[PDB]
Symmetry: C3
Subunit: 221 residues, 3 copies
């Protein structure tokens, strides 16, 4: 199509689809309720991302937001994605360490705040205010990372939890930077490069994360 | 009103309302926590449908979607309905057989994918792509039906579960067909007939299903 | 800004923010899982309200709804707020008295119906129908209050539950009145006064309620 980021949307669509079918095949057989739980959550994540990548690819998850006296193309469908997939990823983590419900509610709630404010930021027509929403969203992220480190077993659990937690902090932290420097933000880095950055992070945080998780014996009772 | 499907919207509004008041009266008295659970879920379903039928009746849940070079009237409020009511119906089933949380999450998640993609399909302005969303949605449905049959007691539970599961597969399967042949799809069958088909399915899947369920002793500890 | 209700939006933004930081500091230290649960829920409430107050302040949560042959300014972001915060407040109550899941599902479901119909009412372009949605929403509220009184311990639990339940019925009941007499409704009381009324209720129902709750020992095992 007439959009140069189409290739990354198509590649992300493809990789999320393949990841979904892999984990779907993979989870065939599992009878342990606990593992079943990790398979459900972890397959749903790239399944959802698959549809939102397709929606961006086909142009449905794309809108135009006027700001800085111009018509800026915003892929809103990333937030419909993250809205659902980021809490699920946090659940994987939470279930791994047997977190209190209070801590899970704090994380999921913090998360919704993170994406929803990111969304508002993305759709806001007053340029300056866009970065107020960014700041609040980033504060929510920082709370989440705080909890992951100070708000929380079988060594297998701990070992896998430590790895995925590290994967999580490192990739999740890059998203505010990408946003801030890309088309939604200061407009430093073009949309096509921004889309590639998000595709590389999304596949790693979704399919990379799930591969690490689902190969672990930490998921079995 | 100037819409010939108004009669079916009015009749559905009426039947969902009556079903809600019946199950509300019916559940008065119930102290068994387990049955209480089935009453809550099963009353909420036509209550929600009642509001969405009223919203379509009054014209609020109706929008115009350009495709095939025409202004197509789409009742989007059906998806706000299903978004909430189809997972609840799946919960009735899941609680009946004491399903693992992993299986419940897979079903609810599969379900959201089903309706959300149906919604995107419904609102998509490129005619051809409408049926890509249909296909994905249908794949989600097929997964759900798979799980209902291969992903899962007191004989009462089994007996009622077997009946409602059969009701479920048969009516849920007709919805993709109706969509595909009606105004959202190929435009084979007019909107007023399509609305009647959906009203007959919705009342049967909601009020018919609940009557069968709530008369059963399968719902009591 | 050019809006005379800005001061109340700014004051609400401020008070919700301060309430969020107070309860966040306050909950530092808590290790009792049960109390943790009450801290999560109760901090999230004004956190969410903070963002929606900011969104109204900045003008993002404001839209124009034509009715009565005029362009009526509707703050839709109040419903995005309530959609999440009113169920959470009901959870605080529900967890306090150890409510059955059936009763919690009935309350949360009743609640979503309440706000969602309030939203539809708010955005409806046919003046008369606006009050049909109001009536249904009010019926949902009345059900909720019914349950709080007839649908349900340590004396501490009972004592705090009795107080907060009284706070709840009294403030929640004023919201339908405010709506009905203000800009969304009959247009009796101007928007700026309406916004002040909602700001006073919101801070009391959110921060006032949380202060009463979180000072109680009812929240600890
Ligand atoms: C499945 C994809 C994942 C793990 C995406 C994570 C996205 C975030 C952690 C986003 C955070 C952002 C902020 C902290 C600042 C504002 C903009 C956002 C939403 C990109
Ligand atoms: C309360 C009403 C019920 C049980 C409705 C069920 C609706 C479905 C099972 C819808 C499925 C569809 C597809 C599988 C294809 C795409 C379009 C849909 C959403 C009509
Ligand atoms: C955090 C704020 C709270 C507790 C807000 C509560 C709001 C309600 C109880 C709203 C109810 C309304 C109706 C019953 C009638 C229609 C309009 C509403 C949504 C204002």
């Amino acid at each position: 199509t007439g959009r140069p980021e189409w290739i990354w949307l198509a590649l992300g669509t493809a990789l999320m689809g393949l990841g979904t079918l892999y984990f779907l095949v993979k989870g065939m057989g599992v009878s342990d309720p606990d593992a079943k739980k990790f398979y459900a959550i972890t397959t749903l994540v790239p399944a959802i991302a698959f549809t939102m990548y397709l929606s961006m690819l086909l142009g449905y998850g794309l809108t135009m937001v006027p700001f800085g006296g111009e018509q800026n193309p915003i892929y809103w469908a990333r937030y419909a994605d993250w809205l659902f997939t980021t809490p699920l990823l946090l659940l994987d983590l939470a279930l791994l360490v047997d977190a209190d419900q209070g801590t899970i509610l704090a994380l999921v709630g913090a998360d919704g705040i993170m994406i929803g404010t990111g969304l508002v930021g993305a759709l806001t027509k007053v340029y300056s205010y866009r970065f107020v929403w960014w700041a609040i969203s980033t504060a929510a992220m920082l709370y989440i990372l705080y909890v992951l480190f100070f708000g929380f077993m079988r060594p297998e659990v701990a070992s896998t939890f430590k790895v995925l937690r590290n994967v999580t902090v490192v990739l999740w932290s890059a998203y505010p930077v990408v946003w801030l420097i890309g088309s939604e933000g200061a407009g430093i880095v073009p949309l096509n490069i921004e889309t590639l950055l998000f595709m590389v992070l999304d596949v790693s945080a979704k399919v990379g994360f799930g591969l690490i998780l689902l190969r672990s014996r930490a998921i079995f009772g």
